[PDB]
Amino acid sequence: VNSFSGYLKLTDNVYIKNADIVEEAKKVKPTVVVNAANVYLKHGGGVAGALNKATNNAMQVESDDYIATNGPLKVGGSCVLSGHNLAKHCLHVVGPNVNKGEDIQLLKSAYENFNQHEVLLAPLLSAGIFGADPIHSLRVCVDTVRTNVYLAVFDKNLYDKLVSSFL
Ligand SMILES: O=C(O)C[C@H](NC(=O)c1ncnc2[nH]ccc12)c1ccccn1
DSSP states (O other): OOOOOSOEEOSSSEEEEESOHHHHHHHHOOSEEEEEOOTTOOOOSHHHHHHHHHTTTHHHHHHHHHHHHHOOOOTTOEEEEEOTTTOSEEEEEOOOOGGGTOOGGGHHHHHHGGGGSSEEEEOOTTOGGGOSOHHHHHHHHHHHOOSEEEEEEOOHHHHHHHHHTOO
């Protein structure tokens, strides 16, 4: 038993809600919140900009030190950093950004990072301003992640569309 509330059950291990991931994180304080990052960990907009703003820019400061030491992530890759005031840990996961011309096939690799964590609060990878088909992303999530994932979808119209089209 865990502390997530009002999530619609999609499968044996995937739950979904129409909610702001920042607000869910501040309420639940999950072990792991997933950030929809880029390879430079430049947290400008979307999930990343919103999470970082909620940490008062501490996420960005930590991320800049990470990049200075380690260099950029790979598309499809991830790193574990602090969750600051939002969670114990933040798993920064890089899904392909279609608006940058990145390989959509890399979405499955991106979701595989979730399997290293027993429970996660996450956004829908590569959706929104990342430019991929969100129905496809939810499908890849359900077909790739085996650990317990709680998906927080910001856009109300998007959430309704995702639920009504889920096979
Ligand atoms: O779920 C959605 O609608 C799409 C989702 N976006 C957000 O969660 C989001 N975007 C902007 N400002 C925000 N403030 C609080 C939440 C939030 C998303 C997923 C992957 C990549 C990019 N974007």
